[PDB]
Curated annotation (Swiss-Prot):
GO cellular component, one term: cytoplasmic vesicle
Major subcellular location class: cytoplasm
Lineage, broadest ranks: Eukaryota, Viridiplantae, Streptophyta, Embryophyta, Tracheophyta
Location of the protein in the cell: Cytoplasmic vesicle
Disulfide links within the chain: C9-C204, C56-C66, C71-C77, C121-C193, C126-C177, C134-C145, C149-C158, C159-C164
Organism this protein belongs to: Thaumatococcus daniellii (Katemfe)
Cited function: Taste-modifying protein; intensely sweet-tasting. It is 100000 times sweeter than sucrose on a molar basis.
Protein known as: Thaumatin I
Record PANTHER family: OS03G0233200 PROTEIN (PTHR31048)
Amino acid sequence: ATFEIVNRCSYTVWAAASKGDAALDAGGRQLNSGESWTINVEPGTKGGKIWARTDCYFDDSGSGICKTGDCGGLLRCKRFGRPPTTLAEFSLNQYGKDYIDISNIKGFNVPMDFSPTTRGCRGVRCAADIVGQCPAKLKAPGGGCNDACTVFQTSEYCCTTGKCGPTEYSRFFKRLCPDAFSYVLDKPTTVTCPGSSNYRVTFCPTA
């Protein structure tokens, strides 16, 4: 599956792509404003994620730090990023279909659109100014809007027991971005696409 990752932000982002225990393609790359990075994701990839990282510094060996979405200080991500991170999530070729969604379960850092570039399904978008509107208690000093689980570490926010409901914090993300998961047990906003579709993830799709 091909994913074109486009940075429409006025600022540089460091794109990251991982399945949690491994990089997807090169795993990460710098994307200046307007740059596009095309990656190949292995068919059948289950639980893949693409995100942007902001205010990064990397040395000549690709080791450094990011203010948001840092994946153990690597330019080429092998693991998931440190919240807050808006997430493009996908599972490909799952019983003949692809499943995509955007999630705010790990908070929000950059607005995103995640759409197929092939026929048969619609895209999803979370392009609202979540950082600007972020409740005081969820604001991340390093930038972004944390999810409540990251901030408070409670069974209710983290849905530890599988018996959690929406909260004042999850309702904030849902109000701004109805098309993204706002908590683990949120009514699924997952889109079913034909198996082997191709996609584009666009950071800052509106601005």
